[PDB]
Write a protein that binds this ligand. Structure first.
Ligand SMILES: CC1=C(/C=C/C(C)=C/C=C/C(C)=C/CO)C(C)(C)CCC1
Length: 174
């Protein structure tokens, strides 16, 4: 039935920055092509007097050939007409770690438990994503409540990504 075309994906209606600030732990990930954050991912969202959201993240990264850094990144969110959609310019603090611009959308969150993020880097000629990533976020490093987990799993499904994720560890690494 449902359509996996990016423009169809629903986002978090009336998204609120402030409400969203804080720490978030990465419980599950859907990796994109190439280089990406491995595990122990923690993000920390913030917004300023100007209403511009931002954030720092950190997690193990397995640089080429087993060389495990503990990356520390910085993203800065440029708004869009859609409040749940932003353009995220990121970069690391060291200059060799990866820099980029990524669409960052908030598929759904409840500010206090979970958040589901999605990002489509490259679209297919059919409107579906050719290269995406998704992050399931939890306010508790221990995981989400069965009630929360249930909706999340529903979202993973509407993103045509269910069954593509992978649990993320937080073993102390960073
Ligand atoms: C900015 C940032 C994000 C993206 C971080 C990325 C995409 C890190 C990639 C690191 C690379 C792979 C380092 C290896 O050199 C996430 C979405 C978690 C949320 C907001 C903070």
């Amino acid at each position: 039935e449902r359509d996996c075309r990016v423009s169809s994906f629903r986002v978090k209606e009336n998204f609120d920055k402030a409400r969203f600030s804080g720490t978030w732990y990465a419980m599950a990930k859907k990796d994109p092509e190439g280089l990406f954050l491995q595990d122990n991912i923690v993000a920390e969202f913030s917004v300023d007097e100007t209403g511009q959201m931002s954030a720092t993240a950190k997690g193990r990264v397995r640089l080429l050939n087993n060389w495990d850094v503990c990356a520390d990144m910085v993203g800065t969110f440029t708004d869009t007409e859609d409040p749940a959609k932003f353009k995220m310019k990121y970069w690391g603090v060291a200059s060799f770690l990866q820099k980029g611009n990524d669409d960052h959308w908030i598929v759904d969150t409840d500010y206090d438990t979970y958040a589901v993020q999605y990002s489509c880097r490259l679209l297919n000629l059919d409107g579906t994503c050719a290269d995406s990533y998704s992050f399931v976020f939890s306010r508790d490093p221990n995981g989400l409540p069965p009630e929360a987990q249930k909706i999340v799993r529903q979202r993973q499904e509407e993103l045509c990504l269910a069954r593509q994720y992978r649990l993320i560890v937080h073993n102390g690494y960073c």
